[PDB]
Design a protein around this ligand. Structure first.
Ligand code: NA
Ligand code: NA
Lengths: 298, 299
């Protein structure tokens, strides 16, 4: 049987201050631990990435769940998606408001409905009948996010995880608040199968982050896979696809990928992308290029 | 300069009833002629795909705008998307109501925002603010469809779209749908979603798709087709393969239309029927079933 692995990422974004790097280090290791945990018990690729993403949704350092950036109206409107490489079963939501964990609801969409994509008010109604707790806006809002909003007015990207399990299934999960002063009801790549992620057992899985208009226009995650189906290393593929994204539509960001045969990589063309990976009891972490650290992980 | 072409498609599903065939014909004809009149007057491919799909939106006989299916509480919710092949520029709208032309609203998203994709109340607000009219939601609601919803109490009647190659060698697609009848509030399918409902790139071509929304999304059918044309596959060979893999892998059935950078084109489907029409070299081709392909002169 396979050796399981989880890979996680934060924003493919600008350079991050070195106090915020510490809470970022700890948050990444956390999400990674919840996913590896579940795996190491022979659990599924789907639950692990869901585990991991959920831990970054509940952390206000990251641009997903609580700590989601604010739209034009200073409100949190969130996107998330999930996919299982075995059946290509999938679930997603756009523009959801007033809940803790948009990624759970994507998973609720994947397994309770014969659809794959619910948005704004219809997602919010599905939530009610699944009894998702509806909570006030402020509980997701951080004082940092109000400040940053007046900055781009008076003139931290997606989060995600990929996994391979001890059975050989892969999955991806993605979630985000979108972007600062985004138009109302703006939908990013994070809920667009192929763009914000893809998962196929006969290939591998990918979670992306960056400029989401760019990402959607090149189908960045499925493109990364196209390079692997042509038999490139995982490294090369990400580099062709990220490299295509730069040269064709002037777009920066990054992605994490795991192929069906065990290998995995975290690459980016933006400045920094927090990331972590947990395989064989070692944990791999980093933010800036060629700055990795390996630790041990129970 | 290349000879321009435009292909249009209706929904890719079960057989049409005799009483509708000539109605569907009249729709496909006017939508293709319209689009090719844009291409006759030096028009852009984006302009060509847009107008051919407005036709279909306007026509009560097709599942988009006027005549879209109803969701489970009896209302119309519409998705559309459009893409410029030159710079990969795009716009999309999901779950929109009470506007007459969603494809037209998708165009404004591409043109007049920092964003590729808008949804729901956001989309209402943006349409309203850009001078798009409000129309009683009752006007998109037709009789044929009321009897489908009550009866269902799900049928995948489909989507309409278009692809075009304009005289400069630019490609484009537009896809629009009312979706699957009886749907949950807020269900979005393949049509607004780039790489699935359609994809356009000057480097390879343009595709638009129809069928079961969820399956086209899963295998990313439009982009998947263009991957194979990249590999050497002809437009017919790639449609075969991309549609075969959706059939084997997820057991979805649909159709597509595709036009290459050279102006090679095909209509292909694995569903029983798919209304399609093309205009090219002063000629108007049209089928619904396999082998019925008529080819009359276009004046
Ligand atoms: Na968060
Ligand atoms: Na119509």
């Amino acid at each position: 049987h396979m050796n399981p692995i989880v890979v996680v990422h934060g924003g493919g974004a600008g350079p991050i201050s070195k106090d915020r790097k510490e809470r970022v280090h700890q948050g990444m290791v956390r999400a990674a631990t919840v996913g590896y945990g579940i795996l190491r018990e022979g659990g599924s690729a789907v639950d692990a990435v869901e585990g991991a993403v959920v831990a970054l949704e509940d952390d206000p350092e990251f641009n997903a769940g609580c700590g989601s950036v604010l739209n034009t109206n200073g409100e949190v409107e969130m996107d998330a998606s999930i996919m299982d490489g075995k059946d290509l079963s999938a679930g997603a939501v756009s523009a959801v408001q007033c809940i803790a964990n948009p990624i759970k609801l994507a998973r609720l969409v994947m397994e309770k409905t014969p659809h794959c994509f619910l948005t704004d008010q219809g997602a919010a109604q599905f939530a009610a009948a699944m009894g998702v707790p509806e909570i006030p806006g402020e509980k997701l809002v951080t004082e940092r996010n109000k400040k940053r909003l007046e900055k781009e007015k008076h003139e931290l990207g997606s989060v995600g995880a990929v996994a391979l399990d001890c059975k050989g299934n892969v999955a991806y999960a993605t979630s985000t608040g979108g972007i600062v002063n985004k138009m109302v009801g703006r939908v990013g790549d994070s809920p667009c199968l192929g763009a914000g992620g893809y998962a196929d057992n006969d290939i591998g899985a990918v979670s992306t982050t960056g400029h989401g208009e760019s990402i959607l226009k090149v189908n960045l995650a499925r493109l990364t896979l196209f390079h692997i189906e042509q038999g490139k290393t995982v490294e090369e593929a990400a580099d062709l696809s990220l490299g295509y994204m730069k040269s064709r539509v002037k777009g920066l960001g990054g992605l994490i990928v795991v192929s069906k045969t065990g290998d995995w990589v975290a690459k980016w063309t933006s400045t920094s992308m927090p990331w972590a990976a947990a395989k064989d009891g070692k944990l791999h972490f980093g933010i800036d290029p060629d700055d990795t650290t390996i630790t041990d992980l129970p």
